[PDB]
Each structure stands twice: as structure tokens, then as C-alpha cells.
Amino acid sequence: TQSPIFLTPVFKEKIWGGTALRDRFGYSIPSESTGECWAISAHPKGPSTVANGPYKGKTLIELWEEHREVFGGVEGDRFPLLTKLLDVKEDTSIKVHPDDYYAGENEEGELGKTECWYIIDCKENAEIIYGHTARSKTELVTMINSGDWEGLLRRIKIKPGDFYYVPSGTLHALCKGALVLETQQNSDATYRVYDYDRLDSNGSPRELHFAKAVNAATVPHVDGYIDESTESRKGITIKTFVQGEYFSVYKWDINGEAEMAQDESFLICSVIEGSGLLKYEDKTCPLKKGDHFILPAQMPDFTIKGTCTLIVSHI
Ligand SMILES: [Zn+2]
């Protein structure tokens, strides 16, 4: 296809969620404790539906299975990624995501969940939990059992604009006061080790997966290294956050009119700030904060005019 494919958001309630998705993006949310917006999703538990054009109403799964041409004919049983907006009002659980092998073996073919975080906004003293100090799996087990979160967990102070890559196997948790654009593999495989003994809307504690978390966790933890790059042309500054095995993620900072080309299999796009006008051939497409869309394989060269910021990804 040759035109933008907009996606209608799906929402998920979370004990750590809030109303920021409605307050900052104008979204109609399910509850006053909404933690996640599954923005570009083909996950069975909450797939995005096409919001416009000839495919309006179809799910991203139906597009992947029946119209792979849209995605440049790339291989794979399922659309590979999942993009979310996260309203981390309170702390999320301490957890680890398995890799493709472990997930497939223990979660019935589910993909692993390597992911990354772009911090859109956050409070002044915001942090994240990333990595740990255990030198062996027996030590990790011991320190988790004595709830020595202070000696075990490693914390990183964050600020708006930060980017963190989270390889599967990484013990982590986003903490209270953060608004995040999370790009991850198409998976919902999560092993929690601690959830602060909280109760959900139904008065029941959330599930923990101690054994699986320890099995999936990388020990010892070693901080990986990613090199960012930035380049600018007329009307746009592009920051390249990562070009990894599972995805490449970028930030487009537009001011004025930028000339673009879609030279990948497809581009996943989220407008996180401002508004603008996308023009291609004789067509016009208004863009605004909160829009999520895919630019197909055959998308014609286009321009975006305005003051807006998008986070974009591709495989
Ligand atoms: Zn996570």
C-alpha cells in the first residue's frame, strides 16, 4: 500500500496507572488507573485496529497475515513489535522478560521481550531500577528471599529525553513519576519477582513468577553499551537511539517543513508532541499528539510541516 495506516489505541488498567493518558494525550481511558496504551499492537491480548482507509476496522494481525505487502513482505509468523505509552504514576513491579528461546519453551511460543524506553517526561527525582548486584543465581535467590532490594537492585536517575535499552534477561522496573514510549518485541511475557505486596482492583495480589524470573535472569548483570547519533537536515533533527537485533528506534524533531523518504520495510510512528501536516503526492494527512501510525513499504516520499516530535521504529 501507499498511504499512512493509523491505529486506534487499546488501553490496559494497572494498579500503578493513572489518568495522564487522558490529561496529556486527550485519550478516553477505561479507568482512573490506566497504566498502558497499546499504541501499535498486534498482540492477541489487545491488537490495534486500523483507524482509516480501505482497511479501516481490520486488526494489525489481519494486516500482517493477509496483507504482508504493507510490511514489505518481511518474514515472521507475527508482526514483530509492540509500542506502548506508559503512565507510570506509581512504581511498577520488579521483573525480568525472557528471551525468545525461554519464552517459546515456557510460554507456548510467545516471543521474548527485549525492549527499550524513551522517557517523554518524568518528575525531577525520577528513577528506574536497572540491573542488580548478584554474582550468582544462588546469591540472587538469597537476596530476593530476604527482600534485600537495597543491596540487590541497581538504580539509575532519569530525566526527560533519556533512552534506555533493556535486553531480555535484565532485572528491571520503571518507577513512579514517568511518562514513557516503550518499544518492545510483540510479547506479553513477564516474570515478576516483587510487586510491593499490593492488591489489585479485585482485592487480590498480582502473580509473581520467582522460579521463571531467576531462570530467565542474566547473572551477573553487565550494563550493555549503545551509541547514539544525531543528524539534522532542513526542518528536522533525527536522533538514532539504537539499531539492534530486534529494532531500531529514533526521534524526529520537526520544525518547519521536513522532506522524508520511507526506505525501510515499514515505519512505526508515534506523535508524542505537537502537531503537523503530512503531505505526499496530492494527499494531505493532519498529525497530532497521540496519533500512532505505520508508513507502509511503498509509502511515497513525503513532507511533514509543523512543530512536532515523533518516536519512530522499524525492524
Ligand atoms: Zn518491562
Q: What is the Cα 311 distance to its own chain's centre?
A: 10
Q: Does 249 lie in the same domain as 110?
A: no
Q: Ligand 1 center to residue 95 CA distance, Å?
A: 7
Q: Does 126 lie in the same domain as 164?
A: yes
Q: Does 286 lie in the same domain as 213?
A: no
Residue 181 — left, alpha, or beta (φ > 0 → left; ψ -120 to 50 → alpha)?
Answer: beta
Q: Does 160 lie in the same domain as 75?
A: yes
Kindly report the CA angle at 74 between 73 and 77, in degrees rounded to 5? Answer: 110
Question: Resolution, in Å, please?
Answer: 1.8
Q: Ligand 1 center to residue 97 CA distance, Å?
A: 7
Q: Ligand 1 center to residue 129 CA distance, Å?
A: 11
Q: Ligand 1 center to residue 189 CA distance, Å?
A: 9
Q: Considering 24, 78, 154, 192, which one is annotated as catalytic? A: 192
Q: Does 116 lie in the same domain as 9?
A: yes
Residue where a domain terminates, one of 181, 207, 226: 226
Q: Ligand 1 center to residue 188 CA distance, Å?
A: 9
Question: What cell numbers appear for 178 in the block?
Answer: 514517568
Q: What is the Cα 164 distance to its own chain's centre?
A: 11
Q: Confirm or deny that 292 is annotated as ligand binding.
A: no
Q: Confirm or deny that 172 is annotated as ligand binding.
A: yes
Report yes or no: 166 and 224 within 8 Å, Cβ to Cβ: no
- Tell me the three state secondary structure of residue 299: coil
Q: Does 215 lie in the same domain as 134?
A: yes
The CATH number linked to 104 is 2.60.120.10
Q: Does 35 lie in the same domain as 13?
A: yes
- Tell me the three state secondary structure of residue 68: helix
Q: Does 285 lie in the same domain as 197?
A: no
Q: Ligand 1 center to residue 286 CA distance, Å?
A: 32
In 114-140, which positions are buried (b, 16+ CB within 10 angstroms) versus exposed (e)?
bbbbbbbbbeeebbbbbbbebeeeeeb
Domains in the chain: how many in total? 2
Percentages of the chain per state (helix, strand, coil), in multiples of 5 = 15, 45, 45
Query: Rounded to whole angstroms, what are the CA distances from 98 to 38, 81, 277?
Result: 20, 15, 40
- Tell me the three state secondary structure of residue 2: coil
Kindly report the CA angle at 103 between 101 and 104, in degrees rounded to 5? Answer: 65
- HSE at residue 172, side-chain half, CA atoms within 13 A, is 24
* Run of H or E residues at 101: helix 100-106
- Alpha-carbon distance of 301 to 303, in angstroms, equals 7
Burial of 210 (0-12, 13-18, 19+ CB in 10 A): middle
Q: Does 242 lie in the same domain as 98?
A: no
Q: Does 110 lie in the same domain as 32?
A: yes
Residues spanned by the domain of 246: 227-315
Question: What cell numbers appear for 6 in the block?
Answer: 493509523
Q: Ligand 1 center to residue 170 CA distance, Å?
A: 9
To the nearest 10°, report the CA torsion of 134, 161, 182, 280: -150
Residue where a domain terminates, one of 226, 244, 267: 226
Q: Does 142 lie in the same domain as 20?
A: yes
- Alpha-carbon distance of 59 to 36, in angstroms, equals 19
Q: Ligand 1 center to residue 173 CA distance, Å?
A: 6
Asked if 192 is an active-site residue, the reply is yes
- Tell me the three state secondary structure of residue 265: coil
Residue with cell 509543523: 306
Report yes or no: 74 and 265 within 8 Å, Cβ to Cβ: yes
Q: Does 237 lie in the same domain as 205?
A: no
Residue where a domain terminates, one of 208, 226, 244: 226
Q: Confirm or deny that 65 is annotated as ligand binding.
A: no
Q: How many CB atoms lie within 10 A of CB 309?
A: 18
